[PDB]
Amino acid sequence: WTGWGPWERCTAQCGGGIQARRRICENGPDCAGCNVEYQSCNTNPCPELKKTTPWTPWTPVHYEQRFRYTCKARLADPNLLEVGRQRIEMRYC
Amino acid sequence: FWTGWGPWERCTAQCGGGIQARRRICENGPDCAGCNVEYQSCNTNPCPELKKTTPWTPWTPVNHYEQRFRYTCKARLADPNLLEVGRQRIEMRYCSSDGTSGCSTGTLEVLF
Secondary structure, eight states, rough: OOOOOOOOOOOOOOOOOOEEEEETTTTTOOOSSSSSSEEEEESSOOEEEEEEEOOOOOOEEEEEEEEEOEEEOOOSOGGGGEOOOOOEEEEEE | BOOOOOOOOOSSSSSSSSEEEOOOBTTOOOOSSSSSSSEEEESSSOOOOEEEOOOOOOOEOOEEEEEEEEEEEEEEOOOOOGGGEEOOEEEEEETTTTTTTTSSOOOOOOOO
């Protein structure tokens, strides 16, 4: 066996991944041991990415009020977090 | 000599790519002519788009009809515990004696 190679690219930036190192056994078809080794990488929990919903329209209570929420997700990419459309529910008085 | 291969065991992740491991044992030997553990990909399907609903806003009149609002938080994750909705943030304002003024009629401009 040759010297073990450096650990390659980690799969994910956070929340668990795998990192690989490899080696080659020159002039040997079946050598002693494994040519490839794996390890866990970036085992830190992913940051709690957050996005805010749009404000609701102003409605009277003379005071007028409106509301918004925040969508919190443990993600490695903000593009994987999205806020859906506004749902209006109406009934008569 | 190597013994029979073991089961593929457990996938690393539920979705988005993982590794499954199976093993064997070199009987009466420290160094057999192979690798004791074998890997294969598992659960390469993309993770589902989980959706959670925000709490409803209080019912409010329109002008007689009453309305309320909510949104949906969508995230591609393998675990629902990693998606949550934050606290409701309320912003108010004063409409004063006009009932409108800055709330609805903006800046009243009169030309004399």
